[PDB]
Amino acid sequence: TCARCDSXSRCGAXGKXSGXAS
Amino acid sequence: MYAVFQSGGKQHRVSEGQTVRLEKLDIATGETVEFAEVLMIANGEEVKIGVPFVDGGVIKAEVVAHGRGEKVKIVKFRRRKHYRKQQGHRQWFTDVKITGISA
Amino acid sequence: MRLNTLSPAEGSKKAGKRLGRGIGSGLGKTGGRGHKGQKSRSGGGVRR
Amino acid sequence: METIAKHRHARSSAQKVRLVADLIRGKKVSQALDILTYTNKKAAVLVKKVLESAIANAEHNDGADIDDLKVTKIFVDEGPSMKRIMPRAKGRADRILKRTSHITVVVSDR
Amino acid sequence: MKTFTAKPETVKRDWYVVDATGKTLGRLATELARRLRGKHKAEYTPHVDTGDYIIVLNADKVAVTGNKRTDKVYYHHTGHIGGIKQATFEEMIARRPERVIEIAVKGMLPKGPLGRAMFRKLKVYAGNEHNHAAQQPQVLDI
Amino acid sequence: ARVKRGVIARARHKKILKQAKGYYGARSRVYRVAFQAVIKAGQYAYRDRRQRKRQFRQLWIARINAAARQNGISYSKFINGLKKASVEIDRKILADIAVFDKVAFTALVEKAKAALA
RNA sequence: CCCGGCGAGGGGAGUGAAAAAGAACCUGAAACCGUGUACGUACAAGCAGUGGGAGCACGCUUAGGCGUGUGACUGCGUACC
RNA sequence: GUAACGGGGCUAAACCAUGCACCGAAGCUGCGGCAGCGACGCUUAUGCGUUGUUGGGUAGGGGAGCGUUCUGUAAGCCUGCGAAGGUGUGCUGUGAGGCAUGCUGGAGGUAUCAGAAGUGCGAAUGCUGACAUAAGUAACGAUAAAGCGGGUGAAAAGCCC
Structure with missing residues (x-):
């Protein structure tokens, strides 16, 4: 899997996209 | 006719022919116990106490059974502090059978 | 004198x-071992 | 006398078939067949075959007198589900449980 | 043996008429809530409604002391935006004087299902006549 | 020597699930919830073997005060009258006489009234 | 052999010590999900228990106020790590 | 949202003074039971009718035990007249536990006293498998669009014409 999604976390949800691949 | 007596720190109100579960006595299972400390003998015309014992009355009972009651469970629990105890307990009793009230 | x-x-x-x-x-x-610190760790404790 | 018919490993969820099996419990079998005939569920088609097979197993094996029979005991149990893969968005894999049933109809005239 | 428990299906109840004319509100209401609970009976069990039926009449002529007739305020909240509503003692007397005795007694009774079934044995009236003459209410001097 | 755990673990779980019968939901079906429920019932049993004596004492005193006021004396004056007469009858038996034998209780109230003055 | 679609699945018959061994096959636990029965529940508020406790159901002994199941009502009681 | 007695209510059911009553804890006492330490009557493989005192407890120290698998005892003892395992019931120990049987199971178990441990799980966003919950809910993947007659078939919006 690999789509990212937060402004800046390691893995949260968020509709943005530079922080986030679980 | 009923009567109030006192055996194991507790008091009992009893009639002619009941079975009473008392605390354990050092009496064998065939001897007729005599409670001479009787607090009230009652009827239509009743002998109460003045001074705390009825001087001219006595209760006699046949000792039926020695035994132990239900097993009760003691649980000591201290939350978040790493402590519990489980313990069992059965209490001794003596079932006597009241054979005579002497007013 | 037997084995049991x-x-x-x-x-x-x-x-x-x-x-x-x-x-x-x-x-x-x-x-x-008590609570946290170097002594309670696996392989811990200071040298002689 | 009890007479049992089963559909084991029926390809329907147990929740769907119980909703049709609760229509015809305690009914006479002549009335239950018409209830299942004019019911618009797929489970009605599944459970009507089991009811008709219980009627026929009664008639052929021991039985009596089709006017007498009642549907005394009907129940659906859960069967072995199939495990399938369902791809979703963003490389996530869900599983599909393809749930099966066991349908049991006991018919008995008394 | 065991302590006696009054069975709730053989409890004998009575009917009482109390005239609330000129008596103090809570000093009458506590004897009301005492007899409604059954504290005057030697067979009193706390989980059983052993109390009595009580009929209160002339409840618009109840007395309060001090300056409480123009200054004792009852508050209820409706459950809304503004909600808080506010009526004094003599407004309650002019408006529905049964609720004065009933609020006092319901406050002096326990909470829960059994306290409500105790409150159900209270028949308050703002007049001198009632409707339970079939019940033969013997007169109570409270 | 390798020791499998399943039999003694199953016995230790079945004891706790057997002591959890009657409970609601996972408290009677699930070992994690039922263990906490069984220990909580144990704490309540310990606390309420103490609470029982207090509650029965309350009930006996309420019935003695009820029947004494049925006879015209309060609780405190009546217990004062039974102390100033040297009468050792406890409150369980006085509540039992207040329920079952009202004439004997009237006799005890007359005794305590005569001793009270 | 009978139901069904020259189905799947089942009911008999038969093999067997056993089909409470039928191949989705020794034993068959628990979570989970049902059917039937007994009791409770639609004016009553919260770690769901505990202490008391009526009524009901079912075994009792040949009355005896006790067992088993439910638990109206009531005091206390804010999980575990 | 009454919201500065907990509440109802109270002109005392408020405050001060004098008392006597009474309620009130797991405190003290009564009755029964267990155990730890120090010591007297009878007396040893010392048991106690005894009797002084003690017995909340985290980190931690000390003492005593239960259960599981495997080894000796044991080519012994139980067991197809039913073992292990599973599921109820009853009895019993202060506890971990133990004993006996109903049913299921269908071939192995193991007394006592010693020995050795992969020896005891509820947590580690533990690991594997199974099954829940949300829920029969979202969705069924381009808004290019289908309608009828006949055929086949157990059954046709979708197949063939």
Whole structure:
């Protein structure tokens, strides 16, 4: 899997996209 | 006719022919116990106490059974502090059978 | 004198601490080591 | 006398078939067949075959007198589900449980 | 043996008329809530409604002391935006004087299902006549 | 020597699930919830073996005060009258006489009234 | 052999010590999900228990106020790590 | 949202003074039971009708035990007249536990006293498998669009014409 999604976390949800691949 | 007596720190109100579960006595299972400390003998015309014992009355009972009651469970629990105890307990009793009230 | 009738002397065969076996053995939850710090870690403790 | 018919490993969820099996419990079998005939569920088609097979197993094996029979005991149990893969968005894999049933109809005239 | 428990299906109840004319509100209401619970009976069990039926009449002529007739305020909240509503003692007397005795007694009764089934044995009236003459209410001097 | 755990673990779980019967939901079906429920019932049993004596004492005193006021004396004056007469009858038996034998209780109230003055 | 679609699945018959061994096959636990029965529940508020406790159901002994199941109502009671 | 007695209510059911009553804890006492330490009557493989005192407890120290698998005892003892395992019931120990049987199971178990441990799980966003919950809910993947007659078939919006 690999789509990212937060402004800046390691893995949260968020509709943005530079922080986030679980 | 009923009567109030006192055996194991507790008091009992009893009639002619009941079975009473008392605390354990050092009496064998065939001897007729005599409670001479009787607090009230009652009827239509009743002998109460003045001074705390009825001087001219006595209760006699046949000792039926020695035994132990239900097993009760003691649980000591201290939350978040790493402590519990489980313990069992059965209490001794003596079932006597009241054979005579002497007013 | 048979093989199921021998027995050691009393005080010869003490059991041994098994650490981490519940509330009632006295040595569960960190087992004699206390709480956090260098001594309670695996392989910890300072040198001689 | 009890007479049992089963559909084991029926390809329907147990929740769907119980909703049709609760229509015809305690009914006479002549009335239950018409209830299942004019019911617009797929489970009605599944459970009507089991009811008709229980009627026929009664008639052929021991039985009596089709006017007498009642549907005394009907129940659906859960069967072995199939495990399938369903791809979703963003490389996530869900599983599909393809749930099966066991349908049991006991018919008995008394 | 065991302590006696009054069975709730053989409890004998009575009917009482109390005239609330000129008596103090809470000093009458506590004897009301005492007899409604059954504290005057030697067979009193706390989980059983052993109390009595009580009929209160002339409840618009109840007396309060001090300056409480123009200054004792009852508050209820409706459950809304503004919600808080506010009526004094003599407004309650002019408006529905049964609720004065009933609020006092319901406050002096226990909470829960059994306290409500105790409150159900209270028949308050703002007049001198009632409707339970079939019940033969013997007169109570409270 | 390798020791499998399943039999003694199953016995230790079945004891706790057997002591959890009657409970609601996972408290009677699930070992994690039922263990906490069984220990909580144990704490309640310990606390309420103490609470029982207090509650029965309350009930006996309420019935003695009820029947004494049925006879015209308060509780405190009546217990004062039974102390100033040296009468050792406890409150369980006085509540039992207040329920079952009202004439004997009237006799005890007359005794305590005569001793009270 | 009978139901069904020259189905799947089942009911008999038969093999067997056993089909409470039928191949989705020794034993068959628990979570989970049902059917039937007994009791409770639609004016009553919260770690769901505990202490008391009516009624009901079912075994009792040949009355005896006790067992088993439910638990109206009531005091206390804010999980575990 | 009454919201500065907990509440109802109270002109005392408020405040001060004098008392006597009474309620009130797991405190003290009564009755029964268990255990730890120090010591007297009878007396040893010392048991106690005894009797002084003590017995909340985290980190931690000390003492005593239960259960599991495997080894000796044991080519012994139980067991197809039913073992292990599973599921109820009853009895019993202060506890971990133990004993006996109903049913299921269908071939192995193991007394006592010693020995050795991969020896006891509820947590580690533990690991594997199974099954829940949300829920029969979202969705069924381009808004290019279908309608009828006949055929086949157990059954046709979708197949063939």
